[PDB]
Structure formats: structure tokens, C-alpha cells
């Protein structure tokens, strides 16, 4: 049978392999008829230059538009032949091509996925088809208040580093961008060790590694500054006013990365539409549900290579914005002093819950494996997670959060009707209790 | 490990279970009472009933629940459709029993306190609003209203004049009428059969009474048009397909994947879909076309839901529509048939793999059939689809009465007589 500790123990473990030129391989076997095959590259925006800015997201489109051996829309008709779905997506630190398909068709799968990574037909017929689509998306992307307001947040905190910039880059580059830079950008960042292959499904390791297949792969971080600042785009038309507040935090591999995972579970999150009511446990989900001080808010946690961001994101009506900010800083400050053993548990449990339920399904597993290798190295420390959790103790939390919260310089970014959002020197004077 | 063990009771409530290796352990409970069981004066009840899961049980205060579940770190869900409401609940390997304890009390031992009902009233509007931001929602709910008379046309949401009209009695009656031990199905996943098998027989045995089937839905013609300021027309065009559990109900599923286009390649305009391609050649700038198929117990509908601009709307429909006639004229390609069936097998298997996704399809058979069908059987049933059958089936769509709904600027919209 299965007991909580026992259920950790029987899982197909990570497999690893090398090729000669620095490509990597890895996999797992779920005894399942379907499989995810993918590729995860570390070539990001924070590498790209000021002229190359946006090229990455630009390239991201062209790959499926036809390639060296299989011209335009000959490629797709083979994917739709298998009936396999096909996907790609980007991120500031990563880029991912992957396929969900039956275990059977895998022989073509890689050999297809192989080609797309490197050989790409680049035809200015496609470019002008593309250069519109982007100049179509940029102007629209104003329509989503969320995605915007983040692009405020980075630029305001990180100003003066390659990390401080948009993914897609300013519009003007989209016009001027010529496939010369692309080929250069292609040439630079797509070699191994950068590249990583992964997969999970009915695949066995060795039946992969042979058809890891006779193909080929290929032949920098500097730390970033933290600028305590503010930005306000004040626009009084719109009905509601977003806010985001954040403080800087550690990178991927680091012990404190776990402690803070738990805190932001405890403060919890509320939304308009929950069935919670006024009886919820999360002290901001009880209060802000009572009077609907804010329509909804979630806490986010983002960790880059050497750096991470902590903070929340909340929407509320303009007369109400003050009262969030206070009641917020109540929470962070009651943690760093007055926290308690009991309340820890309800935080601790949820993390065990979400961590595990995050592993259902083929792709979410595989997707994890991809970033992990680039991140922590090979480590997929599943059962170890639990072992790392029991580290967490009362004195653990209050020693951790005393670092990053108490008496710091926040980063505020907001989007109108911001007007009531207090002037900066209030917030800074609201981070540190005077004991009241 | 072990495969599906489903056990009738004398009571008639199906139970089934597996034993997993995972710390993931989840339970589900399905009931036959959906929207189709709301009556004229009875409207809007189900859509309230679905929000009340946190109210005070018979034995436990509404407070002790909500703090209780979260302390464990559990999660409770609710789901409805036009047919089967399902209370889903999930937690860690260990703690299920405390949580298995609450699941009953909610559905077994309700109490509706008039002062705890009235406070919840305003919630509906907040709920109803965020639902209709996607008009692709709001188009559908009109559609059923056009294509029926009595039952299925009912909304999944509460009409507005009906808001202050929900009395506890109405609830407390609709509880016991359409809840009964014949109509319910309890499905575990990671838990041993006997533990599950024990408690269910105890609490969930009530009556009798059952099942009030008087809805034949009586497919009947009609159409609905609506004029709003939005600049993008939506359109649906539907004729009556056949009921679930038929090679036809299988055949239509074959037919869609021929025409029916979900994106299989991100940003890729689907060239394998004859429909979206057959249009784009003779037409202009953005639009979208997709086939639409859904099947219920006594009947199911088939059609295609389109989006365009105000000018093109007239042509887009006529273009796509005649394209179907081509197929009804005998034009066919066996490879596409062979290709489509592959997509179907693909679309189905990848759909099932996820536990939750798997969990739903389990009981979906249960309340309908009462058995389990291994996916292999599905597969072998898939390829049984004949070519002329597909054609002949599509010959029914064109040859039979149709219905429509449209929301947006209608200036150029055709009517069902011009088609």
C-alpha cells in the first residue's frame, strides 16, 4: 500500500546522460502510452544586447513557419499528421520547444524537433508577415492591465542591467530588426552545454539515448543592482487601480529559498469569487473579504539566477487603496516578530499539497525536469523536499524574514487611478514597526 | 496497480475504487441533478445550490469546516453542467478520513438558515458577471434556448428577476427530491475499496423516490438574435445530432476532427482543417471558424461556432456552410478519415491521462452506463466507423431543421431562411 512517507519512495527516478559536445539527456518512465519530448535552452533576454533586444521573442515565431529541409507549412502537416499537439513558449531566462505525442511516433518526433532547433528557413517573405504580427501584438497588449504592470516593475527596480528590459523589446527594434542579427544570435546562444533535452512518458532511457540520435547541438551572468524606487502611471479613466509592491530576494539555489516559499503560503490570497466568505483563515482573506477592501490579490514569488522578487499584486477601488497598504504591512511585520508555531503548520501542509499535485500529468513533470537541470543541476530531490521542509521552525522563519523584510527599501509600481496611493516616504516608514 | 473495481449496492448507488502509489488521494461524488431539473418556478436554484457548500451543516458549524479543511491543507471543489453536479474533494494520502467525513455532512445533512441564505444573495451577480466576459459563453446559453422548448434550454445561471426569489424551502425541497441513493455515485481513487465501501453504505442510503425523468427536451426549431455595440459578431449554426452512446455519437466525433479545428500548432493556422482553409481562400482579414459538437443523454447538438467582422459575417457563413455540402455530396478522402481517427485516439488518450481528467471520465460512464469501459474498447469502437456512415451522418445535418444565435452588430447578418 501507500503511506505518506512510503508514497515518496516508489517513483521512477531521474535518468541522466551526456553526449560528447555537451548536450544533456534525462528522462523518466511512467508506464504510460503518451510522452512529452522537449528542449529547454537557457538563452534569455538578459543576455541580449540593446540592438538585439526583442530578437528572441521574434525568433520564437519563425521556427514553425517552415525550415531548411521542410519548407513553409510542410512541417506542420506532419505534426497534424501524427495528431500530436505542438507548443513553444518563451521566458526571460528560458525558451522551450516541446511536443506531446504518442510513444509510438517518437522516432520522427526528435528528428523533427531536432531540425527546428537549428536549421531554420529564414525568408523575408516570412519576416514581413511576422513584423506585422508583433506590431499587432504590442499595441493590443496594453489591453491587459496585469501583464503591463509587471513590465513596470522590473524596469523600475533593476534599471541599468540587461535584466531590466522587456521581453519583446521596444517597438522600434521590431521594425529595424534584420535577419543578420538573428543568424548571429542563432549562432551564439544555441550551442550546447546551453541546450538540454528531456522527456517523460512510456520512454525508457536507453531506447531514447540511441535515438538521442545522431544529431548535433553546438561547439553570461553579471550580478544586477537593486534600486529602491517608485513609478506611477496615473490614468483616471479606468475603473480600477492596480498596485504591485516588491522587495528583492535570493536566487535559485539557496537554503532560504524554502523558508520564503512557506511564508507566502501563510499570508495567503483572496479573490472576488471564492466560496470562502468571512470565515477564511488567511488574515488578509478574512479582512479584505469582509469589506471587499480589494477585489483580489495574490502573492508572487520569482527567483532569477542570482536574484529573486518577493511581493504581492492587488486590485482595489481608488478610495480604498490606502487601507490595503496598511493592512498589508501589518502582515509582513507581524510575521517577522510575532509569528507562531501553530499557524506554521497550515502553511507547511499546503506546500506539501501543492508541490505534489503540481506533478500530475506528463508535461508538468517533464517541464519541471527541463528547468531543474539548468537550475539546480541534475537534482530532482523529490523525497528530499519533505526532508527539507521539516527544517522549517518558528526560529527558522523569524530569522529568515528578519533579513529581507524589516527595514528595507521597497519597489512600488502602480497603474492609474493610483492617486491615493501614499507618497513614497510613507511606505518606507511603514516597513519597520516602532513597536506600534 | 489493480484495475477498476466497481461495485453496485443493493441501493443502486455505484461505487468504484483503485489503489494508487501516490500521496495524492482524491474522492469524488456525482449526482444526476443538473440544470435540466430546474422547473419554471424552480429556476436559479441549482446555481445557488452550488455556492452554498460552505454553509452550516447539520452537525458542524460553517466556521469549523472552513478553518478545519485548510488546517489539514485540503481542497474542496464543486462542479456543475447541464446534467451532473459533482462534489470533488482531494487531499494528502493520510488525512482523507477526516475529509471523507465532511463530504457526507454537506450533501447528507444540509441545513439552510434564512439568515445565512439572504447574506449570500448578492454573490450571484458577482458570479454571473465574471462568467459572461467571454461572449463565447453568452452565445451558447442563448443557443440551447433557441433549439428546445421545455428542459435543456434552462440556463446554468440564475436569471436576474429571479435573484431575490430564492426561498430556503425551494432549496430544501429540491435537495431531497433529486438527491437519492439510486442516483448517486461515489468514486475514490487512491484509497482502498473496503474503507470506502464501509462508510458509503451507512450514510448514503436514503430512499427511493427517484429520478423525475420527464424531460425529453423535445428538439424544436427556433432562433435568437441580439444587438449589442461590440464590433465582433459571433455566430452559431446548429442542427440536431443524435444522442450519446451511439456509433453516430461516435460518428459525429469522427466528423468534427475532420473539419473541427483546435490549434495543434501554436500560432499555426490549421491547414489540415478543410473548413478554416476552405474559407480563408475566398475571404479576407481576421476571422475564425470551428465545428461545435456536444451530446447529452436524450440528445445532442452539432454545428459550428464562428467569429468574424461585421462585413465578412455574411460571406463567412455561406462560404463555410456550402463547404459542408461538398462533404455531404460524397466528396471524401479515406486518408483524412484515417488521419482524423488518429487525432481522435490522440485527443482522447491525452485527455484521460491526468488524474482529475481521468477521474471525471470514470463516473461519466457510471451515472450513464454503470459499467467501466477500458480505453482499448473505445479504440476498437473508434475504427468501426464506416466511411459512408460519416457521409450519411453529415447528410443529416444539411437535410434537417436548423437554429442560430448571434450577438453583436448584426447589420449584415443573414437569417436562417437565406441558408
Amino acid at each position: 500500500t501507500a503511506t505518506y512517507a512510503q508514497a515518496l519512495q516508489s517513483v521512477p527516478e531521474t535518468q541522466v546522460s551526456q553526449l560528447d559536445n555537451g548536450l544533456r539527456v534525462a528522462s523518466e518512465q511512467s508506464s504510460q502510452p503518451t510522452c512529452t519530448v522537449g528542449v529547454w535552452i537557457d538563452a534569455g533576454s538578459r543576455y541580449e544586447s540593446e540592438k538585439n533586444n526583442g530578437a528572441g521573442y521574434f525568433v520564437e515565431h519563425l521556427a514553425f513557419k517552415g525550415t531548411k529541409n521542410r519548407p513553409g507549412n510542410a512541417l506542420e502537416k506532419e505534426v497534424e499528421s501524427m495528431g500530436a499537439h505542438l507548443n513553444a513558449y518563451s521566458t526571460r531566462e528560458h525558451t522551450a520547444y516541446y511536443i506531446k505525442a504518442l510513444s509510438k511516433d517518437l522516432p520522427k518526433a526528435v528528428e523533427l524537433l531536432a531540425d527546428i532547433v537549428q536549421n531554420c528557413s529564414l525568408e523575408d517573405s516570412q519576416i514581413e508577415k511576422e513584423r506585422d504580427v508583433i506590431l499587432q501584438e504590442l499595441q493590443e497588449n496594453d489591453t491587459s492591465m496585469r501583464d503591463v504592470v509587471f513590465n513596470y516593475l522590473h524596469a523600475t527596480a533593476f534599471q541599468g542591467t540587461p535584466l531590466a528590459q522587456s521581453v519583446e523589446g521596444p517597438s522600434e527594434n521590431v521594425r529595424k530588426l534584420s535577419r543578420a542579427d538573428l543568424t548571429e544570435y542563432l549562432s551564439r546562444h544555441y550551442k550546447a552545454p546551453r541546450m538540454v533535452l528531456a522527456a517523460a512518458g512510456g520512454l525508457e532511457h536507453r531506447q531514447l539515448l540511441d535515438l538521442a540520435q545522431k544529431h548535433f547541438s553546438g561547439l553570461t551572468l553579471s550580478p544586477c543592482r537593486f534600486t529602491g524606487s517608485q513609478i506611477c502611471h496615473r490614468e483616471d479613466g479606468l475603473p480600477l487601480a492596480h498596485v504591485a509592491i516588491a522587495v528583492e530576494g535570493p536566487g535559485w539555489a539557496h537554503p532560504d529559498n524554502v523558508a520564503l516559499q512557506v511564508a507566502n503560503a501563510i499570508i495567503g490570497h483572496y479573490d472576488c469569487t471564492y466560496g470562502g466568505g468571512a470565515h477564511l483563515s488567511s488574515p488578509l482573506a478574512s479582512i479584505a473579504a469582509t469589506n471587499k477592501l480589494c477585489q483580489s490579490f495574490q502573492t508572487f514569488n520569482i527567483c532569477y539566477a542570482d536574484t529573486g522578487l518577493l511581493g504581492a499584486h492587488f486590485v482595489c477601488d481608488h478610495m480604498s487603496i490606502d487601507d490595503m497598504m496598511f493592512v498589508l504591512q501589518g502582515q509582513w511585520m507581524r510575521l517577522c516578530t510575532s509569528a507562531t508555531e501553530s499557524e506554521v503548520l497550515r502553511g507547511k501542509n499546503l506546500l506539501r499539497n501543492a508541490l505534489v499535485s503540481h506533478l500530475d500529468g506528463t508535461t508538468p513533470v517533464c517541464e519541471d525536469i527541463g528547468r531543474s537541470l539548468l537550475t539546480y543541476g541534475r537534482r530532482i530531490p523529490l523525497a528530499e523536499w519533505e526532508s527539507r521542509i521539516a527544517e522549517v521552525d518558528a526560529r527558522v522563519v523569524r530569522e529568515v524574514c528578519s533579513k529581507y523584510f524589516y527595514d528595507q527599501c521597497p519597489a512600488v509600481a502602480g497603474f492609474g487611478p493610483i492617486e491615493q496611493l501614499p507618497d513614497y516616504n510613507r511606505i518606507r516608514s511603514g516597513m519597520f514597526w516602532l513597536r506600534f | 496497480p489493480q484495475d477498476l473495481e466497481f461495485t453496485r449496492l443493493p441501493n443502486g448507488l455505484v461505487i468504484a475504487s483503485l489503489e494508487n502509489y501516490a500521496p495524492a488521494s482524491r474522492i469524488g461524488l456525482f449526482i444526476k441533478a443538473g440544470s435540466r431539473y430546474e422547473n419554471s418556478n424552480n429556476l436559479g436554484t441549482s446555481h445557488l445550490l452550488r455556492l452554498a457548500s460552505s454553509l452550516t451543516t447539520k452537525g458542524a458549524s460553517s466556521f469549523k469546516i472552513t478553518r478545519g479543511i485548510e488546517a489539514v491543507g485540503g481542497k474542496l471543489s464543486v462542479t456543475s453542467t447541464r446534467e451532473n453536479m459533482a462534489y470533488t474533494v482531494e487531499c494528502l494520502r493520510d488525512d482523507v478520513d477526516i475529509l471523507m467525513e465532511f463530504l457526507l455532512n454537506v450533501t447528507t445533512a444540509p441545513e439552510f438558515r434564512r439568515w445565512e441564505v439572504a447574506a449570500l444573495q448578492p454573490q450571484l451577480r458577482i458570479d454571473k458577471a465574471v462568467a459572461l466576459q467571454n461572449p463565447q459563453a453568452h452565445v451558447i446559453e442563448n443557443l440551447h434556448a433557441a433549439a428546445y422548448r421545455n428542459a435543456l434550454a434552462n440556463s446554468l445561471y440564475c436569471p436576474d428577476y429571479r435573484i431575490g426569489k430564492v426561498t430556503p424551502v425551494e432549496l430544501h425541497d429540491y435537495v431531497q427530491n433529486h438527491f437519492t441513493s439510486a442516483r448517486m455515485a461515489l468514486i475514490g481513487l487512491g484509497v482502498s475499496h473496503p474503507v470506502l465501501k464501509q462508510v458509503a453504505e451507512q450514510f448514503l442510503n436514503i430512499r427511493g423516490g427517484l429520478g423525475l425523468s420527464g424531460a425529453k427536451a423535445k428538439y424544436h426549431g427556433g432562433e435568437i438574435r441580439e444587438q449589442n455595440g461590440d464590433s465582433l459578431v459571433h455566430a452559431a449554426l446548429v442542427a440536431e445530432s443524435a444522442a450519446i452512446g451511439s456509433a453516430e455519437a461516435n460518428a459525429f466525433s469522427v466528423l468534427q476532427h475532420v473539419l473541427g479545428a483546435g490549434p495543434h500548432v501554436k500560432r499555426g493556422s490549421n491547414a489540415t482543417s478543410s473548413l478554416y482553409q476552405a474559407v480563408a481562400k475566398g475571404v479576407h482579414q481576421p476571422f475564425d471558424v470551428s465545428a461545435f459538437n456536444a451530446s447529452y443523454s436524450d440528445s445532442g447538438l452539432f454545428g459550428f461556432y464562428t467569429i468574424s467582422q461585421a462585413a465578412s459575417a455574411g460571406d463567412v457563413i455561406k462560404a463555410a456552410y456550402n463547404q459542408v455540402k461538398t462533404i455531404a455530396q460524397g466528396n471524401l478522402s479515406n486518408p483524412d478519415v484515417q488521419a482524423a481517427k488518429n487525432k481522435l485516439k490522440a485527443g482522447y488518450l491525452m485527455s484521460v491521462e491526468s488524474s482529475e481528467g481521468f477521474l471525471d471520465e470514470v463516473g461519466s460512464q457510471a451515472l450513464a452506463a454503470g459499467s467501466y469501459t477500458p480505453p482499448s474498447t473505445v479504440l476498437q469502437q473508434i475504427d468501426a466507423v464506416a466511411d459512408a456512415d460519416v457521409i450519411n451522418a453529415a447528410k443529416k445535418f444539411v437535410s434537417g431543421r436548423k437554429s442560430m444565435a448571434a450577438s453583436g452588430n448584426l447589420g449584415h447578418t443573414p437569417f436562417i431562411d437565406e441558408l
Partner: peptide, 22 residues
Amino acid sequence: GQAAGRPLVASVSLNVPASVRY
């Protein structure tokens, strides 16, 4: 034309906000 994974739509409300579907 969206059922798209499965039959018609859904409504789900628990905690986590709400979910529509096709």
C-alpha cells in the same frame, strides 16, 4: 466551435477563483 476538450462548458466555484470551459 468550442467544446474543444470534452462536452459543453462548465462552472466551478470552490476556492481558487472560478473556471469557465468549453
